[PDB]
Structures are given as structure tokens and as C-alpha cells.
Amino acid sequence: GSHMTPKDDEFYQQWQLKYPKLILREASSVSEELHKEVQEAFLTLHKHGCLFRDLVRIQGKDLLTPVSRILIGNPGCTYKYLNTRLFTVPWPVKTEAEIAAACETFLKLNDYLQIETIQALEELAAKEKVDIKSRAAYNVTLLNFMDPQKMPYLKEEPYFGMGKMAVSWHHDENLVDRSAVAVYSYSCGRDPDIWHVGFKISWDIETPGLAIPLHQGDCYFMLDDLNATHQHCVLAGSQPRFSSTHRVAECSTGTLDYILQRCQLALQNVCDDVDNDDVSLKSFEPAVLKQGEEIHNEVEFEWLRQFWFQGNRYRKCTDWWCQPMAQLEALWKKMEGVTNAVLHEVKREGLPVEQRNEILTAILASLTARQNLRREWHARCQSRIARTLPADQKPECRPYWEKDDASMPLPFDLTDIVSELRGQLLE
Ligand SMILES: O=C1O[C@H]([C@@H](O)CO)C(O)=C1O
Ligand SMILES: [Ga+3]
């Protein structure tokens, strides 16, 4: 293998003929005003300690990101990566002081970056001689920080000899299709002291990868299918680095509006005159019961457990999600009641056996899934790393109720219940 930088003579030709979908802008193309405004936003966020490293699950394993990070952007939005749903600390489209001003700042930056992106995608679709407008509609930014020479060893980038790296080779998952990504970098063989972003064609380690030096304020853009045709990575220097990576996320199953409406659909099968521990289900068509138990699972695990695993990231940063998340927890325990209601009806004296088997076969996949996933989550909350962390770094394991708590109709452990119903059906 090998790699190239603006030193090498064939760099510019390799870029033109094998990486053309990538664009650079030196800090020189950006306002003075904007430059120091964003840097001051960045810094006041570091002093207040909002940048958290997240505790992730990847291929069965519980790991700790060396970069610290935070997710800002559209209110009600979420962005899922490495099995972690980051929730928006919001910026002001139509909470705590001194932080509002940085979110405002990064939104101004988002508008600027939008502008430049659309110009570039114009020129590109011009070389080709609502996709454009929406592939620039950045809805969130993932900010991230790393102080090198605090890591105890950094992985040597292994296919091209690019030296130590702070982010392995990857694509930016879960973005809308052919959407660009706009980065703002902030620094302080190839040169090891200076920060670089490195690039390579996927599956490929013959074609020499590029490694672009990024000085303070340098910006770049991954356009069209670039983010899919190539993977990238971030090579470290010696000074701490910031970067703000602005993206258009697939938030079609990941907004507070969406999960709420899902809840209303589940609850439509429920007699809603009053609200008490007294759930009487409106229908028993198997399909409806199944859709209910699925929405049960979706709000429990994609929304509750996720929110509370990033234990106190949130009520430290903003309060925005509090009333929302409280509301989601309420709807979830009413769904617990719905489930207990079905569990009652299925064993009732004088229910025809064929209906019993139909209703079982409708719900059992969702019950089994709820069981397996509560197992994973209590495991992850009592992880190697988790159960021995800073006392605030610990994730919370919510919802979790004990046996004696009668406020909850059904147990937290359902293995015997799934065993029971499966032992009915296979007879
Ligand atoms: O520099 C980067 O920061 C983000 C981070 O989220 C890594 O997972 C990303 O995707 C990069 O390439
Ligand atoms: Ga990336």
C-alpha cells in the first residue's frame, strides 16, 4: 500500500480522477465573523463539559468512544449510530443560558454550509453535461472533540501507513440517500503533528488513499454518492481537535412526532373514556393486537431505554426532552396495561381454542422480542465498563421495577410467560 498528500506530484491528478466528489475550502473562503464566532461557540461548550463519550454496543461488545461528542440541531430529531440514539440538543428554528448562543451560532453555520453545498452540487450536476435542494437540507450536526496524548496508544492506520488515527475507516451511517456531509475542522510519510482527513475507495487497498491536511477553519464536503463509494477516517496530530459534521439524517422513524403518533395508533385499540389501572381492549383481531405489541416494543427500546442509557447527558445539557420523555413513559406503562389485558383475555373461561392459537401466533414474536431485548439492556447497563465508571457516567436502567411493586401489572421478567404461552401453542 501507500498514500498521498499535497506534497506529492500525482496527488492532484489522483484527486481529479478518483476522488472528484470531494471538495475542500481553506478557512480563507469563510467570514472572519463566522470563524471566530463558531470557535467561541465550540469553546464555551467544552468549558461547560457537555461533550460526552458514549458507551456503545458493537458486534456484541461494550466500548468507549475516544472522541467526546454532542448532537445539536432540529428540535424533536434523533440520529442513531453504533446502536445509540443521540437526541437533539436543539437549535432555534420557528433551556440553559450561554448554551443557547452556541446553538444559535451553529445554526447560522448550518445555513452557510447549506449555501455552499448547493452551489457545489449545482456545479457538479453541471459537469453532468428536489434531489439537489433536499440533499443539502442539513438537519443536524454531530460535534466532536479529542485531546490526543491523553489516549494511552493510538491505532496505526494499517492499509496505507497514514499513522495514528482517532476514527477508524468508516462510512457515515443512517444518512438520507446521496446526501452530502459538510465538515468544519478546528486544529491548533505524512505530517504527524497536523490533523488530516483520509479517504479510500471501498473494498480497495490498492488504489492509494488520500490524506488531506486540515488547518484551523478548513471546511470540506462529501458530495453525492461519495460517502458511499469511499470510506473515510480522521488522522490525529498533536494538538486537540474539534470538528462539526453537518448531515441530513434519515429521521423518518426517529422523531418525537413519529413515535408519538405511533403511540396514538397503539392506544386506538383501547377504551379511552377514563385513565386508570383498568384496560379494556376494543378489538381482538390478531393483526391489531400484534401491531400494538410492536409499538410497545418500539417506544420501550428505541426511545425509553435509549434516552436513559445516556444517563445524565441530557438534564445536564438541556431539559427539552423531559416532558416528552415523561409522556413517553406514561404511554409505555399504559401499554403494559394493554398487554396484561391481552394476557387475561387469552386464558378466559370459554374462549374458542382456534382463536386462542390465532391470537398467540399473532403476539408471540413480539413477546419473545421484548424478553430478549430486556435481557440485552439490563446486561449492557451492568457492563464491565458501565458498572465501574464515574458515579455520574453510569447509565440509568429505566424502566426497571421490582417484583413487589404492584403499580405495574406485569413482571419485568417474562421468560416464564413466554414459556407458558409457547407451551400452550405447540400442543
Ligand atoms: O470526524 C468524524 O466524526 C464523526 C464521528 O461521529 C465518528 O463516528 C465522523 O463520522 C467522522 O468522520
Ligand atoms: Ga464520519
**Domains located in the chain, CATH noted:** 3-247 (2.60.120.590), 256-391 (1.20.58.1470)
**Quick one: which of 245, 150, 148 has its CA closest to 195?**
148
Residue 109 — φ and ψ, nearest 5°?
A: -60, -40
Q: Answer whether 145's CB lies under 8 Å from 135's CB.
A: no
Q: Which ligand has its closest atom nearest to the C-alpha of 166?
A: 1
CA of 234 to the centre of ligand 2 (A): 8
User: Is 141's C-beta closer than 6 angstroms to any atom of ligand 1?
Assistant: no
Report whether 170 contacts 156 (CB < 8 A). no
CA gap 192, 62 in Å, rounded:
30
Q: Ligand 1 within 6 A of 227 CB?
A: no
Give the contacts of 427 (CB within 8 A, at least 6 positions apart): none
Q: Which atom of ligand 1 is nearest to the CA of 142?
A: 6
Give the separation between CA 253 and CA 256, rounded to whole angstroms: 9
Distance CA(94)–CA(13), nearest Å, equals 46
Cβ contacts of residue 332 below 8 Å, gap of 6+?
Answer: 296, 299, 300, 304, 399
> Who contacts 370 (Cβ-Cβ below 8 Å, separation ≥6)?
293, 296, 297, 300, 414
Looking at ligand 1, which residue's alpha carbon is closest to its atom 10? 172
Ligand at minimal distance from the CA of 56 is 1
Contacts of 339 (CB under 8 A, 6+ apart): 293, 296, 410
Q: 138, 133, 130: which is closest to 172 by C-alpha?
A: 138
What whole-number distance in Å separates Cα of residue 208 and Cα of residue 199? 9
C-beta 142 within 6 A of ligand 1? yes
| Residue 150 CA, ligand 1 centroid: distance in Å | 19
Please give the backbone phi and psi of residue 156, each rounded to the nearest 5 degrees, phi first: -70, 120
Entry field: residues in the chain: 427
The answer to whether the CB of 243 is under 6 A from ligand 1 is yes
Instruction: Please give the grid coordinates belonging to residue 261.
Output: 403518533
| Residue 357 burial (CB count, 10 A) | 16
Residue 62, judged by CB atoms within 10 A of its CB (0-12, 13-18, 19+), counts as middle
The sign one gets for the Cα dihedral 334, 250, 247, 61 is positive
Q: How far apart are CA 193 and CA 311, in angstroms?
A: 35
As a three-state string, the secondary structure of the chain is CCEECCCCCCHHHHHHHHCCCEEEECHHHCCHHHHHHHHHHHHHHHHCCCCECCEEEECCEEEECCCEEEEEECCCEEEEECCEEEECEECCCCCCCCCHHHHHHHHHHHHHHHHHHHHHHHHHHHHCCCHHHHHCCCCEEEEEEECCCCCCCCCEECCCCCEEEEEEEECCCCECCCCCEEEEEECCCCCCCCCEEEEEECCCCCCCEEEEECCCCCEEEECCCHHHHEEEEEECCCCCEEEEEEECECCCCCEHHHHHHHHHHHHCCECCCCCCCCCCECCCCHHHHHHHHHHHHHHHHHHHHHHHHCCCHHHHHCCCCHHHHHHHHHHHHHHHHHHHHHHHHHCCCCCCHHHHHHHHHHHHHHHHHHHHHHHHHHHHHCCCCCCCCCCCCCCCCCCCCCCCCCCCCCCCCCHHHHHHHHHHHCC
**CA 375 to chain CA centroid, nearest Å:** 22
Residue 167 Cα to ligand 1 middle (Å): 7
Q: Are strands 230-235 and 196-201 parallel, antiparallel or unpaired?
A: antiparallel
Task: Give the strand order in the sheet containing 140-146.
Answer: 22-25, 219-222, 181-186, 241-247, 140-146, 68-73, 89-90
Residue bearing the CA closest to ligand 1, atom 12: 233
Work out whether strand 3-4 and strand 209-213 pair parallel, antiparallel, or are unpaired. Answer: parallel
Q: What angle do CA 177, 183, 187 make, to 5 degrees?
A: 155
CB under 8 Å to 52, separation ≥6 — which residues? Answer: 68, 69, 70, 310, 313
92 burial level (CB within 10 Å; 0-12, 13-18, 19+): exposed
Q: Taking Cα atoms as reference points, which of 24, 220, 254, 25 lies closest to residue 139? A: 254
245 Cβ below 6 A of ligand 1: yes
What type of residue is 147?
Answer: D
- Is residue 68 within 8 Å of residue 53, measured between CB atoms? yes
Ligand 1 atom 9: residue of nearest CA: 172
| Cα 118–chain centre separation | 25
388/383 Cα distance (integer angstroms): 8
Q: What are phi and psi of 335, to 5 degrees?
A: -70, -35
Q: Which technique was the structure solved with, according to the deposited record? A: X-ray
Which cell numbers in the block locate residue 235?
A: 488522522
Q: What CA dihedral angle connects 259, 264, 265 and 268, to 10 degrees? A: 160
Q: Is 86 in the pocket of ligand 1 (CB under 6 A)?
A: no
Q: How far apart are the first and last CA of the chain?
A: 62
Residues 6+ apart with CB under 8 A from 18: 201, 207
Give residue 172 CA to ligand 2 midpoint distance, Å: 5
Q: Residue 172: CB within 6 Å of ligand 1?
A: yes
User: Which residues are paired to 69 by β-bridges?
Assistant: 52, 144
* Closest ligand 1 atom to 243 CA: 1
